[PDB]
Amino acid sequence: MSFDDLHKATERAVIQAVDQICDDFEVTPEKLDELTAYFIEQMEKGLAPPKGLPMIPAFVTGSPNGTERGVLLAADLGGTNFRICSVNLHGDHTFSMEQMKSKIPDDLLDDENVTSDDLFGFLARRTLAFMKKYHPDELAKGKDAKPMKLGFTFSYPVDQTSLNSGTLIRWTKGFRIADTVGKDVVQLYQEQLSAQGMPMIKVVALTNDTVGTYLSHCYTSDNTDSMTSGEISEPVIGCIFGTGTNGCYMEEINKITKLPQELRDKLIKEGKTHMIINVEWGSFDNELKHLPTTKYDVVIDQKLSTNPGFHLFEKRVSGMFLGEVLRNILVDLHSQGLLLQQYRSKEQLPRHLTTPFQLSSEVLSHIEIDDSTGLRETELSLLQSLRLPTTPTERVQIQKLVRAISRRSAYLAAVPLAAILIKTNALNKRYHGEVEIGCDGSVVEYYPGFRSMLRHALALSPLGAEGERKVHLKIAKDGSGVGAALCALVA
């Protein structure tokens, strides 16, 4: 056929093939029902003694009201940095901030055999510099003063035998230091704090970023938590979607069959009815019994991934992998002759479409909501910020693919929220019963319309579109810094 005839036939075939890839990417409401039911099943398997889900009790039996008073501290430590924050709760749904971001120490931790004393003394040194800098209010009263409660955000593998008690099991995503496999991390931090000179500091909390997100959403609840006035709604889920994904919710105390009955009765004999469970829902259905999977998901999880087959739901939802899936689809369609069709072979393609993760997520951000830009002006430009240029008929299908990837990730992200809301139902305060779930992270906050698709999925779930609209949801953003302080408050 003619060059023009072949071009037209090729464009029609690209229509076909891209629609077929989309069909292979779709999430049906039937699959939604299947996934949420299996998630309820994994939840109930998990928190009973032996496994369904890594549902780790966070040992928090109280939620902030947004009416709270006082000033508290918060320490967080990871491979990223070390941070000492200080929060002054104004007494309304507001607060005031102070903080020092002590950079991760330059190579006292690079797989050298260093003491817990070295690392935790660096932590306490930065805490002492903090106290000296912004207030020696009770630091000048170094012998004794009115104490200060602070929460610790130690985002490492930890065995939290209770609140303000953690027994570190390993340094993963960090580097191995000597003989901390049995130490209590809150105890080490407290020892180093009382050893530099502040004995006023009490380390009374230990939680990770998701429990902090939940507590930071309890505070600052849009005037829907101060009283049963206007909207009558309470927050029941904290969660982070983005580079990673996880969530936490409050479960009945006597429904956590895992914890021994001693602690359960000792809590219920108090005013204590519920406790926060940090559902590790990252790495959900790793066995892939129900979790949808395509070819590109396999080729990325196996070859290009650092966790070969461990956090599968994370990888299907994370913001890093969206652009990666798009890149693999593009390289596929090219090497099979349908797209970018005058780069005569692979390794003639631009340097970023060939190499692994060079297709970032802001690309999909710009592409997904392309307005009628006189047919893909900002989209062409931004997709062309990486070295490859494109044509209109190709850009239409590339937008199709990007939107399909995003919709799948959003519906999957909605599955666990729906399963939690339907396990602990939102229809128990029979009248005006409403529930808001607060969210942090990259994808959920800044990806265009990822919340609209979350809502559409929650409507298409066995959470009924009839009942989805008693759940409105928005963002609570600081969990390592404000959430730790609030976990110290409710300690």
| DSSP notation for 9-26 | HHHHHHHHHHHHHHHHH-
- Pseudo-torsion of CA 353, 357, 362, 364, nearest 10°? 60
- 300 DSSP assignment: I
User: Do 222 and 369 belong together in one domain?
Assistant: yes
Q: Where does 342-465 show beta strands of DSSP type E?
A: 434-440
Q: Report how far residue 164's alpha carbon sits from residue 206's, in angstroms, rounded to the nearest whole number.
A: 5
Pair 348, 214 in one domain: yes
Q: Based on the domain organization, do 121 and 233 belong to the same domain?
A: no
DSSP letters along 76-112, please? EESSS-EEEEEEEE-SSS-EEEEEEEEPPPTTSSSS-
| Close Cβ partners of 67 (under 8 Å, ≥ 6 residues apart) | 91, 92, 226
Separation of alpha carbons 302 and 326, rounded Å:
17
Distance (Å, whole) CA 267 – CA 274: 9
87 and 179 part of one domain: yes
Say if residues 53 and 43 touch (Cβ distance below 8 Å). yes
Q: Helix, strand, or coil here: 258? A: coil
Domain holding 115, by residue range, is: 67-208
CATH number of residue 379's parent domain: 3.40.367.20
Are 214 and 170 part of one and the same domain? no
Tell me, yes or no, whether 434 and 486 share the same domain: yes
What residue has token string 């690392």?
Answer: 119
What CA–CA distance (Å, rounded) separates 135 from 86? 10
Which one of 208, 235, 264 terminates a domain? 208
User: What distance in Å separates the CA atoms of residue 460 and residue 34, rounded to the nearest whole number?
Assistant: 12
Question: Which residue type occupies 225?
Answer: D
d(CA 399, CA 396): 5
Q: Are residues 269 and 409 in the same domain?
A: yes
Euclidean distance between CA atoms 31 and 37, whole angstroms? 10
**What is the DSSP secondary structure assignment for residue 319, as one 8-state letter?**
H
Query: 21 φ, ψ to 5°?
Result: -60, -40
Residue 134 and residue 132: Cα distance in Å, rounded? 6
H or E element, residue 264: helix 261-268
Tokens of 366: 């710009």
Q: Same domain for 60 and 192?
A: no
Closest C-alpha to 445, from 470, 421, 474: 474
174 and 114 Cβ atoms separated by less than 8 Å? no
* Amino acid identity at 243: T
**Closest by alpha carbon to 418, among 459, 463, 460, 451?**
463
Residue 190 CB-density burial (10 A; 0-12 exposed, 13-18 middle, 19+ buried): buried
Which residue bears the tokens 């939102």? 426
CA dihedral 252, 418, 462, 51 (to 10 degrees): -70
Residues flagged as binding site for ATP? 101, 478-483
Name which of 237, 137, 121 is nearest 188 in CA terms: 121
Contact at 8 Å (CB) between 10 and 394?
A: no
DSSP helix/strand/coil, 346: coil
Q: Which residues are catalytic?
A: 155, 170, 209
User: Which residue type occupies 313?
Assistant: F
Resolution expressed in Å: 3.6
Do 236 and 357 lie in a common domain?
Answer: yes
CA distance 371 to 13: 25
Distances (CA, A) of 437 to 233, 379, 418, 454: 10, 33, 11, 12
173, 208, 243 - which closes a domain: 208
CB 81 within 8 A of CB 106: no
SS3 (DSSP) at 479:
coil
Candidates 18, 25, 20; CA nearest to 397 is 18
Cα separation, 434 vs 451, whole angstroms: 18
> Which CATH number characterizes residue 204's domain?
3.30.420.40
Domain boundary among 208, 235, 263: 208
Same domain, 185 and 214: no
Do 104 and 74 belong together in one domain?
Answer: yes
Same domain for 327 and 199, yes or no, is: no
Tell me how far apart the alpha carbons of residues 10 and 2 are, in angstroms, rounded to a whole number: 12
How many domains would you assign to the chain?
Answer: 3
Distance CA 130, CA 134 (A): 6
Residues contacting 127, CB < 8 A, separation 6+? 75, 84, 193, 196, 198, 201
